[PDB]
C-alpha cells in the first residue's frame, strides 16, 4: 500500500521536525534519529520502485506488511512522547528524553533489519543466510524459509532445544532478542542474538550470565550514554561496561576506564564476549563492571550450575531491558492509566485484575475511579 | 574519544 508508505512519511516527517528543534540539541552520534528516518524512508521508496507492477507480491509479503505496521506505531509513539513529555524533552537527563534515546536505538535496529531483508530493495528474506551454522540449522528446521515468526511460535520452538525456565525468563529474553519491539522475531534478529550470545551450545546460559545476571551489562544504551555513565568512575580505572554495538549490529561494545583516567570503548571483532571479558579481567583492564568492586567469574562458560532468581529477572526487566511494557506482565504494552493514582499498565493485566482480584489498583491498592487510554509513558 | 579503539593490550 503506497497509502501505507505515504501515511508513514507524514508521521516520520513530523518526528524529524520535532527532533530538529534547537532546544533539543541532538548530537550527530550514532544512533542519530535525524539520519535514521529519512534513510528508512529512502530505502522504502527503493523497495517501492522494485515492485512497480509487481506490487501484489509486496502486498502479500508478510514481513514488509508487519514492518510498516511497526514503523507507524513507533513514529506515532515518538510523536506523543513529545506531546506528553513537553518541556521535559529538552532536559538532557530526563526520563522522557531517555525514552527518546531508546527509540533512536529501535529505529536503528529496525533499519538494519529492513536493509538485511530487502537489500537493494529486493526481498531476499526467504534466502537469508544465518551466520552460525548451529543457529542456522535450528531456524530452517523449525521455520523453513520464514522471515519472521510470532514470538510465541519462536519461544516454543526454542524451548525444545534450550530450556526456558519460566514466563519471566521468557519475558527477560524476549526483551533482549526482540529488537524491533513488536512481538515477532525475524530471522535477522535471531541472527544477531545468536551471534551476540555464541556459542549456540550454551546459548541461554551465556545470555543469562552475560546479559541478565551481569551488572556490567547495559540494556538499550548508546556510545554517548556509556561515555556519560563512566564519568563518576573516571577516578576508578578498571571500571567498565558493555552493551550491544549500534553501528556493528551483532557485536559487543565494551566501554572502560583506563589508569590514564580517560574513557575508551572497543569492539572485539571475532573473539567471544566472555573470553574477551575473561582475558580483559586477567590483563587488568575490566575490573569493576558499573564501578562495583566485585567482578564475576565467568570461566566455565568455557565448559557447574547456578541459578537466576525470579527476583533477578524482574530486576533486568525493571532496569530498562523492556521498552514501554507493563511492569506487571512485562509482556504487553502500557496502554492504560489508572485515576486517581496515575499508575500505568496494560489493559490485559487491568482487566484480569478488576474481574478476579477486585476494584483496587495493583501497585498501590487505591480504588480505581476512572481510566485514561495512553500511547506512551515518558517516564517508563 | 568518539570512536571505537582496538581492544586494549
Ligand atoms: Ca521483533
Ligand atoms: Zn500487563
Ligand atoms: Zn495505583
Nearest Cα of chain B lies from the Cα of A232 at a distance, in angstroms, of 17
**Which CATH entry fits the domain spanning A1-124: 3.40.50.1820, 1.20.930.20, 3.90.550.10, 1.10.10.60?**
1.20.930.20
Asked if A65 contacts A51 with a C-beta cutoff of 8 angstroms, the reply is: no
Nearest Cα of chain A lies from the Cα of B3 at a distance, in angstroms, of 8
Residue A224, annotated as binding a ligand: no
| Chain B nearest-CA residue for A246 | B4
Cα distances from A234 to residues A215, A238, A255, in angstroms, run: 18, 9, 12
Q: Provide the edge-to-edge strand list for the sheet that holds A344-345.
A: A344-345, A336-339, A370-373
User: How far is A270 from A33, CA to CA, in rounded Å?
Assistant: 29
CATH domain A125-213 topology: Recoverin; domain 1 (1.10.238)
Cα distances from A79 to residues A69, A72, A278, in angstroms, run: 16, 11, 43
Q: What angle do CA A33, A111, A175 make, to 5 degrees?
A: 90
Residue B3 DSSP symbol: S
**Experimental technique for the deposited model:** X-ray
Cell numbers standing for residue A112:
538494519
Q: How many CB pairs under 8 A join A and B?
A: 27
Residues with CB under 5 A from ligand 1 (ion): A 178, 180, 182, 184
| Dihedral pair phi/psi, residue A336, rounded to 5° | -140, 150
User: How far is A258 from A240, CA to CA, in rounded Å?
Assistant: 9
User: How far is A71 from A123, CA to CA, in rounded Å?
Assistant: 18
Q: How many residues does chain B have?
A: 9
User: How far is A378 from A82, CA to CA, in rounded Å?
Assistant: 9
User: How far is A121 from A117, CA to CA, in rounded Å?
Assistant: 9
Nearest Cα of chain B lies from the Cα of A242 at a distance, in angstroms, of 13
Asked if A44 contacts A5 with a C-beta cutoff of 8 angstroms, the reply is: yes
- Contact between chains at A266 and B6 (C-beta distance less than 8 A): yes
Residue A182, annotated as binding a ligand: yes
User: How far is A172 from A211, CA to CA, in rounded Å?
Assistant: 10
Q: How many CB atoms lie within 10 A of CB A297?
A: 10
Asked whether the domain spanning A306-380 has the same topology as the one spanning A1-124, the reply is no
Domain ranges in chain A are 1-124, 125-213, 214-299, 306-380
Burial A97-117 (b: 16+ CB within 10 A, else e): bbbbbbbbbbbbbbbbbbbbb
Ligand nearest to the CA of A348: 2
Grid coordinates 529492513 are at which residue?
Answer: A114
Asked if A308 contacts A208 with a C-beta cutoff of 8 angstroms, the reply is: yes
Nearest by CB to B4, which of A29, A262, A266?
Answer: A266
Cα distances from A116 to residues A78, A183, A298, A299, A357, in angstroms, run: 24, 19, 33, 34, 46
**Which CATH entry fits the domain spanning A214-299: 1.20.140.10, 3.40.630.40, 2.40.30.60, 3.30.505.10?**
3.30.505.10
Residue B1 DSSP symbol: -
Residue A178, annotated as binding a ligand: yes
Q: How many CB atoms lie within 10 A of CB A363?
A: 14
User: How far is A149 from A143, CA to CA, in rounded Å?
Assistant: 8
- Largest CA-CA distance found in chain A, in angstroms, rounded: 63
Grid coordinates 482487566 are at which residue?
Answer: A351
Cα distances from A40 to residues A85, A108, A183, in angstroms, run: 25, 9, 21
User: How far is A139 from A154, CA to CA, in rounded Å?
Assistant: 9
CA of A327 to the centre of ligand 2 (A): 7
User: How far is A188 from A173, CA to CA, in rounded Å?
Assistant: 16
3-state secondary structure of B2: coil
Residue A243, annotated as binding a ligand: yes
CATH domain A306-380 topology: Herpes Virus-1 (3.30.40)
**CA pseudo-torsion sign A300, A301, A304, A306:** positive
Per residue, the 3-state secondary structure of chain A, as one string, reads: CHHHHHHHHHHHHHHHHHHHCCCCCCCCCCCCHHHHHHHHHHHHHHHHHHCCCCHHHHHHCHHHHHHHHHHHHHHHHHHHHHHHHHHHHHCCCCHHHHHHHHHHHHHHHHHHHHHHHCHHHCCCCCCCCCCCHHHHHHHHHHHCCCCEEEHHHHHHHHHCCCCCCCHHHHHHHHHHHCCCCCCEEEHHHHHHHHHHCCCHHHHHHHHHHHHHCCCCECCCCCHHHHHHHCCCCCCCCCEEEEEECCCCECEEEEEEECCCCCEEEECCCCCCHHHHHHHHHHCCCCCEECCCCCCCCCCCCCCCCCCCCHHHHHHHHHHHHCCCECCCCCCCECCEEEECCCCEECHHHHHHHHHHCCCECCCCCCECCEEEECCCCCCC
Strand pairing category for A288-289 and A239-244: parallel
Burial A317-343 (b: 16+ CB within 10 A, else e): beebbbbbbbbbebbbbbbbbbeebeb
Amino acid at each position: 500500500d503506497k497509502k501505507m508508505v505515504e501515511k508513514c512519511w507524514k508521521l516520520m516527517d513530523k518526528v524529524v521536525r520535532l527532533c530538529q528543534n534547537p532546544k533539543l540539541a541532538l548530537k550527530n552520534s550514532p544512533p542519530y534519529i535525524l539520519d535514521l528516518l529519512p534513510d528508512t524512508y529512502q530505502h522504502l521508496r527503493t523497495i517501492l520502485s522494485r515492485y512497480e507492477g509487481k506490487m501484489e507480491t509486496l502486498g502479500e509479503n508478510e514481513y514488509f506488511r508487519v514492518f510498516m505496521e511497526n514503523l507507524m506505531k513507533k513514529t506515532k509513539q515518538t510523536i506523543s512522547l513529545f506531546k506528553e513529555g513537553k518541556e521535559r524533552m529538552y532536559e538532557e537527563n530526563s526520563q522522557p528524553r531517555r525514552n527518546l534515546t531508546k527509540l533512536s536505538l529501535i529505529f536503528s535496529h529496525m533499519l538494519a533489519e529492513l536493509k538485511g531483508i530487502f537489500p537493494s530493495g529486493l526481498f531476499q528474506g526467504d534466502t537469508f543466510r544465518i551466520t552460525k551454522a548451529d543457529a542456522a540449522e535450528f531456524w530452517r528446521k523449525a521455520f523453513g524459509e520464514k522471515t519472521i515468526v510470532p514470538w510465541k511460535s519462536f519461544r516454543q520452538a526454542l524451548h525444545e532445544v534450550h530450556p526456558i525456565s519460566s514466563g519471566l525468563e521468557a519475558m527477560a529474553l524476549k526483551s533482549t532478542i526482540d529488537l524491533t519491539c513488536n512481538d515477532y522475531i525475524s530471522v535477522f534478529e535471531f541472527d544477531i542474538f545468536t551471534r551476540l550470545f555464541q556459542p549456540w551450545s550454551s546459548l541461554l546460559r551465556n545470555w543469562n550470565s552475560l546479559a541478565v545476571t551481569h551488572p556490567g551489562y547495559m540494556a538499550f544504551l548508546t556510545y554517548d550514554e556509556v561515555k556519560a555513565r563512566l564519568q563518576k568512575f573516571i577516578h576508578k580505572p578498571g571500571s567498565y561496561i558493555f552493551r550491544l554495538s549500534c553501528t556493528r549490529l551483532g557485536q559487543w561494545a565494551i566501554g572502560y576506564v583506563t589508569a590514564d583516567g580517560n574513557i575508551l570503548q572497543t569492539i572485539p571483532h571475532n573473539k567471544p564476549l566472555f573470553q574477551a571479558l575473561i582475558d580483559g579481567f586477567r590483563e587488568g583492564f575490566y575490573l569493576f563492571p558499573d564501578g562495583r568492586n566485585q567482578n564475576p567469574d565467568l570461566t566455565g562458560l568455557c565448559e557447574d550450575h547456578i541459578k537466576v532468581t525470579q527476583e533477578q529477572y524482574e530486576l533486568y526487566c525493571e532496569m530498562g531491558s523492556t521498552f514501554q511494557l507493563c511492569k506487571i506482565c512485562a509482556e504487553n504494552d502500557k496502554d492504560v492509566k489508572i485515576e486517581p493514582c496515575g499508575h500505568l499498565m496494560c489493559t490485559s493485566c487491568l482487566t484480569s485484575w478488576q474481574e478476579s482480584e477486585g476494584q483496587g489498583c495493583p501497585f498501590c491498592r487505591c480504588e480505581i475511579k476512572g481510566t485514561e487510554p495512553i500511547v506512551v509513558d515518558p517516564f517508563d | 574519544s568518539d570512536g571505537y579503539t582496538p581492544e586494549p593490550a
